[PDB]
Design a protein around this ligand. Sequence first.
Ligand code: V42
Ligand code: V42
Ligand code: CA
Ligand code: CA
Ligand code: CL
Ligand code: CL
Lengths: 9, 9, 228, 228
Amino acid sequence: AGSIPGRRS
Amino acid sequence: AGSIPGRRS
Amino acid sequence: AMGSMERASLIQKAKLAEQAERYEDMAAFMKGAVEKGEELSCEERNLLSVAYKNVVGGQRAAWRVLSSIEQKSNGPEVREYREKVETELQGVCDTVLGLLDSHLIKEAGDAESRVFYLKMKGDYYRYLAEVATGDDKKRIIDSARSAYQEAMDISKKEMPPTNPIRLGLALNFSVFHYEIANSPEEAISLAKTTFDEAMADLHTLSEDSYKDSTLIMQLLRDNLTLWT
Amino acid sequence: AMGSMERASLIQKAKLAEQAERYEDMAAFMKGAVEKGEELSCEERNLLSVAYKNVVGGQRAAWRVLSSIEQKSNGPEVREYREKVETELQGVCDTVLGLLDSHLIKEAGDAESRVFYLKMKGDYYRYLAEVATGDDKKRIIDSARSAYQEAMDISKKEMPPTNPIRLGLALNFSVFHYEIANSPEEAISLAKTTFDEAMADLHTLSEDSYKDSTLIMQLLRDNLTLWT
Ligand SMILES: *Cc1ccc([N+](=O)[O-])c(OS(=O)(=O)c2cnn(C)c2)c1
Ligand SMILES: *Cc1ccc([N+](=O)[O-])c(OS(=O)(=O)c2cnn(C)c2)c1
Ligand SMILES: [Ca+2]
Ligand SMILES: [Ca+2]
Ligand SMILES: [Cl-]
Ligand SMILES: [Cl-]
């Protein structure tokens, strides 16, 4: 399912 | 303001 | 770099790239298709326009973010990076303009193709004008104006007032007047006259054409609401 | 191509590129910063990871769209274009892996940096595994597993069970088990044990650390809900 979205910051 | 979005199709 | 790929394969890959939201690839595939030298069908013209509109739309959004930061700050980094983005945006606009000039417009004899390409020419000069300064800005503004005006003159003679290309041309020329040419009253007059003339022609349309035309008319009304 | 730009200017431009949503530029700026040869601070590690996660995230989404079309169809165009996207994705993963191997991991001695980089190594092998087939897939899967396992072993010895890097490592290793390694029971056990051990340590945290840890715990619970 979801990994760390990790696309902000 | 808004021009034709024109980004689909 | 697309010279070795079949025209039909470039078109098919442009459609796949649109589905994959790979707009840079889509624009490169459609540039390759244009450079095959044949005229573009209606669907192919739309693929060319959608591809470049998405590429330059991303660049314009980034340029606006960076310009806003740069203006708040007034080291060289924000200006340098805004300049890099600006140059890349200018290059995409010059590429599109070059396709139109070599040789899409000169081979376009039907009103729907010629108006479509001249509207694109106005749009890409308009995006150049958005980032231009001073006494380059003037000539770029005039080039946009001249392209939109030729398209308007053809569209009024050759297409009904509900034709979606005619409507979108008028919408975008009105945005040119309001945002670029400092002519808000001309923008409002054009949007109002376009809307009213389309309204009066809706009775001639099928259900599906009515949906197409009213969608763009709503955009004209949304701008008029914002401008008045 | 960033060798002539100051490290501090690359970092500043990576932050501007993030604000402008220009993730390819952001990744190139952070690659240039890594190649200056100094270790990365905590904030700089996060900029490196965010940049590449966005680049490879776009590629993975496009690859999934194209693979789905290709599987529905089973001319060469969909396969050829899926292969092009796949090669570009593999190249980005190889670039990130190369930065980690030359020389970020070997210079990382503190647990927070070493776990961070080994989690990245597991993640980028995992993205390679998503597109791999057969008896290359096996070695790539093992490389992901080995990187995640080393990170897990350090994190359990050196960080509290609420540390966000420890939590995100465990989340992503559980996704590895479920989606790549065909070990759904190991995925569920790891997510449950991680969640429970973090819950028991929340009482030690400040308000802001509590918010950080509970955010990731919610992701563990969301996966557990989907998997059970
Ligand atoms: C893998 C990972 C887990 C947690 C965090 N973090 O919450 O700091 C990471 O740092 S990050 O910059 O990549 C990130 C991801 N999501 N946020 C809010 C930050 C990485
Ligand atoms: C400028 C323009 C106006 C209308 C249309 N159209 O409705 O067909 C255009 O074609 S398009 O492919 O660029 C487009 C834009 N929005 N849609 C739904 C299609 C162009
Ligand atoms: Ca041919
Ligand atoms: Ca220096
Ligand atoms: Cl012709
Ligand atoms: Cl060190």
